[PDB]
Amino acid sequence: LLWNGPMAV
Amino acid sequence: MIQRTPKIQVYSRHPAENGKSNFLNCYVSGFHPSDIEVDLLKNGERIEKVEHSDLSFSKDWSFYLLYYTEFTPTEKDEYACRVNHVTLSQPKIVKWDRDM
Amino acid sequence: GSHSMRYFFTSVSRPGRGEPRFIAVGYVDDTQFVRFDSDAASQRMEPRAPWIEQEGPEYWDGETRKVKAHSQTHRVDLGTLRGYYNQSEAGSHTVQRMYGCDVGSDWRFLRGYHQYAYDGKDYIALKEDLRSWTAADMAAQTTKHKWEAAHVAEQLRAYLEGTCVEWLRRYLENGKETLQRTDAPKTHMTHHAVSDHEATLRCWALSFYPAEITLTWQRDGEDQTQDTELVETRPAGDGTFQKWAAVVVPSGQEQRYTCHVQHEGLPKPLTLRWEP
């Protein structure tokens, strides 16, 4: 299951 | 910017036997950037029905792909893989050696 | 043995040619189980292993939403990074991201990781403690400060120690018949004379899983890399792997050489010796 929270650099 | 030239292996899935169905593989690895042209060749002509794996990468961030096709080896037929990449001054053609 | 779940993402910009290419792939150990490719027909997350096919529409809908969110983040990142490094619009650039978790033999959390690269080099990584970042250069320091302000590590650690390991365990149980199996290498040696004074010995390892393997030649029990040749381990295409290692030896001295094979699938390492 993927992470739900990537954040822009 | 980094550029890395591809390593290429051309081999069969199973030991080669004339008249027995098999898969011919062209494994390209260690390259960057990701744009790469890979064709499998039969007696110098491109094979259309070739599949490929999903792009992935190794611990050093270099990319790898497997290209493959169903085929039946015969006495007469020669195979090769043709690879083009930004690091190559001309496309590289690697012959299938049936014992390797 | 231990296991892992890893996701790999690549994003590539296309100067003068619109939206970036985006490819995502997920793995349990060395077995791919899902993919997403922006060039493909479905525009959904898709199954690539039998055991994940049983997950219901809520899983597929959810994974599609989340993978599209990854894609959208990377599209923003390619523009931001082009700005940070003041790169021209003419060139293609690449972002890569990998994250995942490992568990031990008891299937309990062992470690977690998250690595990000721009144009094939480290940009920012999560430290082993899962609480702070390592930035590769001055532009990545900007990102580190943003991510500290938004408490990214905290929520990423929650995923890496929680959700990641819980879902890995589910996958291991559902895919048990193929994921918790090791395929020991099938091994053999070939001999080819080169001349009256030399011959090649080649040690083969075929049909093995997982991919990790060590093949080494010894002469009179001493490690030998002079006059040796090793290929990279390569996929067979059927979910197993192949490798070979070769040495050129004097004619009549073949029996002084041994090939040593180490693999998780073997109860003890193998020693092979050429017997005419």
Author numbering:
A (entry chain C): 1 to 9
B (entry chain B): 0 to 99
C (entry chain A): 1 to 276
Article sentences:
Recently, we described the remarkable decade‐long persistence of human stem cell‐like memory (SCM) CD8+ T cells specific for the HLA‐A*0201‐restricted Yellow Fever virus (YFV) Non‐Structural protein 4b214‐222 epitope (sequence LLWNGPMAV; hereafter, A2/LLW) in the context of YF‐17D vaccination. Several studies have shown that this A2/LLW epitope is highly dominant and prevalent amongst YF‐17D vaccinees 9, 10, 11. Here, we show that A2/LLW‐specific TCRs are highly biased for the TCRα chain germline segment TRAV12‐2. The specificity of peptide‐MHC (pMHC) recognition is conferred by the six highly flexible complementarity‐determining region (CDR) loops that make up the antigen‐binding site of the TCR.
We were able to solve the atomic structure of the A2/LLW pMHC complex at 1.59Å resolution. Electron density around the peptide was unambiguous. The general features of the binding are similar to those observed in other peptide‐HLA‐A*0201 complexes: the nonamer adopts a conformation with central bulge between residues at position 4 and 6 where the side chains are protruding toward the TCR, while the peptide termini provide binding into the HLA binding pockets with many specific interactions. The A2/LLW complex showed a melting temperature Tm of 66.5°C and transition enthalpies ΔHvH of ca. −500 kJ/mol. Thus, the A2/LLW complex is very stable when compared to other pMHC complexes that are also recognized by TRAV12‐2 positive TCRs (Tm / ΔHvH 66.0°C/‐610 kJ/mol and 63.0°C/‐380 kJ/mol for A2/Tax from the human T‐lymphotropic virus type 1 (HTLV‐1) and A2/ELA, respectively). The overall conformation of the LLW peptide binding to the MHC molecule is similar to the ELA peptide thus facilitating the modeling. Five peptide residues are pointing toward the TCR: Leu1, Asn4, Gly5, Met7 and Ala8; and these predominantly contact the CDR1α loop. In particular, Asn4 extends into a polar pocket of TRAV12, where its side chain is making a network of hydrogen bonds with the side chains of CDR1α Ser32 and CDR3α Asp92, as well as non‐polar interactions with CDR1α Gln31. The backbone of the 3 first and last residues are nearly superimposed, and the corresponding side chains occupy the same MHC pockets: Leu2 of LLW, ELA and Tax in P2; Ala8 of LLW, Thr9 of ELA and Tyr8 of Tax in P8; Val9 of LLW and Tax, and Val10 of ELA in P9. Alanine substitutions at each position of the LLW peptide revealed that the central region of the peptide (positions 3–5) was key for TCR recognition as these substitutions were deleterious to recognition; in particular the Asn4→Ala4 (LLW‐4A) was very informative as it completely abrogated the response of the YF5048 clone.
